[PDB]
């Protein structure tokens, strides 16, 4: 057994972390006080779920997690919420004034004063690990803390944990729920600085999650709570192999090996099905073939884009519920004949499949219906670069006029970091084009 430490940075990272750990507790039978009746080894163990939970002598199962935000109101809700007993106070870190939607304020001005404290709190968890594998880092692209402080934290983690894998769950900005007009700046700045320090990053476009909630959950105006419960389901599907017995994606290193053949192109596309409303009184349970076929509909992706017009480098299918390999292979044979699934020429055309028999868990009173079977597809397709093209275009429009640049320069950043960051993105988009034509 090898431990994983989760780090949640900024409002988006913290609130998504809340949703994930709530779901983790429900999936493992861990109560809000940290007790786990099914765990017969009191005070310790090297079970699969111990990758995410440590144990006290009193039988408390404590998330291997740190929450950090430059302002306290969001993490204060964790300190007084349903799962307040779950976390030790020292893993919940807050300042008093946030990055004001400003990457440079989060990375330089305010981040320089709290980075050492955060690394010391992370060191405290690392010392409880017999064989730490790496980190899972949750944050927004658009927030000043989520972008600015995350990139600083990621750099230092490479220095202090050089041999450790680092995975990201990143919230890509969407105007329908976005908060700041400068989020394209913060996204490009943080992506540039973080690119070489991340082994694998799962982007979630709030636009995709928003529309999925409106379309399939019949929520007219989804809130963060609606979005995060859906995101936590996808995050759970992705991390289930780390928390449960199995042969696929059992260590963070395996994510890179299975999903990322080139280091810089390390942004797999997540596609999830089925998303069914709890309110719907009559539902027809979808078969293996139907939910698998849904993995190739852009409407079910975490980022809207067209994989038919890109190339695949890797594809994993993560099933939960009543699924046997025979039906998966049958569904795949049909799908291959009716869909445009092109792989790069230097990669085999194949699916890596994992099945957990336990069907997806849903939070009581939530919006998601209980389903008999679900699947999350992780495909590394060049089509995801459409999202970079979109982001870089918005960046170019504002930066051509230097709009808002004075706010970043005023925090100690140099104008040249804007163009340096943008050039890295131009190279990234070029990489995706070489691999996809």
């Amino acid at each position: 057994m090898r431990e994983c430490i989760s780090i949640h940075v900024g409002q988006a990272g913290v609130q998504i972390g809340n949703a994930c750990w709530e779901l983790y507790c429900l999936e493992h039978g861990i109560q809000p006080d940290g007790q786990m009746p099914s765990d017969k080894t009191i005070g310790g163990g090297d079970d699969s779920f111990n990758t995410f939970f440590s144990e006290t002598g009193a039988g408390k199962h404590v998330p291997r997690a740190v929450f950090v935000d430059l302002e306290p109101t969001v993490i204060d809700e964790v300190r007084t919420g349903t799962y307040r007993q779950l976390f030790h106070p020292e893993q919940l870190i807050t300042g008093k004034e946030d990055a004001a939607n400003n990457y440079a304020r989060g990375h330089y001005t305010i981040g320089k004063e709290i980075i050492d404290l955060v690394l010391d709190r992370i060191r405290k968890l690392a010392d409880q690990c017999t064989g730490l594998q790496g980190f899972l880092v949750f944050h927004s692209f658009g927030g000043g803390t989520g972008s600015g402080f995350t990139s600083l934290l990621m750099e230092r983690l490479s220095v202090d944990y050089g041999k450790k894998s680092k995975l990201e769950f990143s919230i890509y900005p969407a105007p329908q729920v976005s908060t700041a007009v400068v989020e394209p700046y913060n996204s490009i700045l943080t992506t540039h600085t973080t690119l070489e320090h991340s082994d694998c990053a799962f982007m979630v476009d709030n636009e995709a999650i928003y529309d999925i909630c409106r379309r399939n959950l019949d929520i007219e105006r989804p809130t963060y709570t609606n979005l995060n419960r859906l995101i936590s389901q996808i995050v759970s599907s992705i991390t289930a192999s780390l928390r449960f017995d199995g042969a696929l994606n059992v260590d963070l290193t395996e994510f890179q090996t299975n999903l990322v053949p080139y280091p810089r192109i390390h942004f797999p596309l997540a596609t999830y099905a089925p998303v069914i409303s709890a309110e719907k009184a009559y539902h027809e349970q979808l078969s293996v073939a139907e939910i698998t076929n849904a993995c190739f509909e852009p409407a079910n992706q975490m980022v809207k884009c067209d994989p038919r017009h890109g190339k695949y480098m890797a594809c994993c299918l993560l099933y939960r519920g009543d699924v046997v390999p025979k039906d998966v292979n049958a569904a795949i044979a049909t799908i291959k004949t009716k869909r445009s699934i092109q792989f790069v020429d230097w990669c085999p055309t194949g699916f890596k499949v994992g099945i957990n028999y336990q069907p997806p868990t849903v939070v009581p009173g939530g919006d998601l219906a209980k389903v008999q079977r679900a699947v999350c597809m992780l495909s590394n397709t060049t089509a995801i670069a459409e999202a970079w093209a979109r982001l870089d275009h918005k960046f170019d429009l504002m930066y051509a006029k230097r709009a808002f640049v004075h706010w970043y320069v005023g925090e100690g950043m140099e104008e040249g970091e804007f163009s340096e960051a943008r050039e890295d993105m131009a190279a990234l988009e070029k990489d995706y084009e070489e691999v996809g034509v």
Binding site: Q176, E297, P298, A299, K304, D306, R308, H309, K338, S340
Partner: protein, 332 residues
């Protein structure tokens, strides 16, 4: 009001479609780079499909199918037919073609049977009967090009003994309905057909531009369906519908149904339509052959008003409705 942007000022078709939209009073034109548009009349190269369908509160439509180039480039068309089982290696309405990369593997294998049975053995790039002289031409150029069997026995109009090609305009809407404009046009050669030398190629190349005697038998070397049909009746005792148009509809349907999975926008966050130009060649036996597909065609001055008005009715107002049909729907 509905909003639209114009990003290909060189399009005669959509220049006319702009005016019609403005003339309705319910359409406003924005500047090229304004993102809050309902309709994009996009550029022809590097159209940013990835930026479409991400504007909250705007249903967005574009006049091009992403992925339709696979059909509208000569090299890609040949690959699409040889490798797609729906069309297949032995498709009856596409001439033998081979893709040749200029610094040929199997082309010489067929050309060397050509010398066996002493059959017609002229090919096209640009026309020749000797391979090693068209290949000196391919490589002294630079880009890729296809070499295709030149049809030696075409149908010749009388009087004149003339060669011709048929251009059909086909509109595909956001629902992937396939609409064949009822008006076609024959692009005739004002020169008599000479099969004794292909070096002189004004009687072989039927392009309206390459006809710089031009305008003799009919205005602008354009014979339309009304007259061409009456000709087929007087001359050959048949109709345009029976002898030619059935095969043309079959070919159009086949091509577009083959790529529908790859280019359909049915469940996409943006919507597409596109106007295609299919070019057909008719042989001595009233047999139709597909020559190529144009993804950004122009029209004939006679037909601009009617066809462009039809694009608005079928492709634009169907998605953005306002406050007898000239198309034949090819069913599938």
């Amino acid at each position: 009001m509905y909003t639209f942007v114009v990003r290909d000022e060189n399009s005669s078709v959509y220049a006319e479609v702009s005016r019609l939209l403005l003339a309705t009073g319910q359409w406003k034109r924005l500047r090229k780079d304004n993102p809050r548009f309902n309709l994009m009349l996009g550029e022809r190269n590097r159209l940013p499909f990835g930026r479409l369908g991400h504007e909250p509160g705007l249903v967005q439509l574009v006049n091009y199918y992403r992925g339709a180039d696979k059909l509208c480039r000569k090299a890609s068309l040949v690959k699409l037919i040889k490798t797609s089982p729906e069309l297949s290696e032995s498709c009856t309405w596409f001439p033998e073609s081979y893709v040749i990369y200029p610094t040929r593997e199997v082309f010489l294998a067929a050309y060397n049977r050509r010398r066996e049975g002493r059959e017609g053995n002229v090919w096209i790039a640009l026309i020749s009967s000797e391979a090693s002289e068209l290949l000196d031409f391919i490589d002294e150029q630079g880009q890729v090009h296809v070499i295709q069997k030149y049809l030696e026995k075409p149908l010749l109009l009388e009087p004149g003994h003339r060669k011709f090609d048929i251009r059909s305009w086909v509109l595909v809407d956001h629902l992937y309905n396939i609409y064949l404009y009822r008006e076609g046009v024959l692009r005739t050669s004002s020169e008599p057909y000479n099969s004794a030398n292909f070096q002189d190629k004004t009687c072989h190349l039927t392009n309206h531009c390459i006809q710089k005697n031009y305008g003799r038998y009919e205005e602008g070397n354009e014979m339309f369906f009304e007259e061409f049909n009456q000709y087929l009746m007087d001359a050959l005792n048949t109709t345009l519908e029976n002898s030619i148009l059935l095969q043309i509809k079959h070919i159009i349907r086949s091509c577009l149904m083959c790529i529908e999975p790859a280019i359909s926008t049915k469940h996409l966050h943006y919507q597409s339509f596109q106007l295609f130009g299919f070019d057909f060649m008719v042989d001595e036996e009233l047999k139709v052959w597909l020559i190529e597909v144009n993804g950004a065609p122009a029209c004939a001055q006679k037909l601009y008003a009617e066809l462009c008005q039809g694009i608005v009715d079928v492709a634009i107002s169907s998605v953005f409705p306002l406050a007898t049909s000239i198309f034949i729907k090819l069913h599938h």
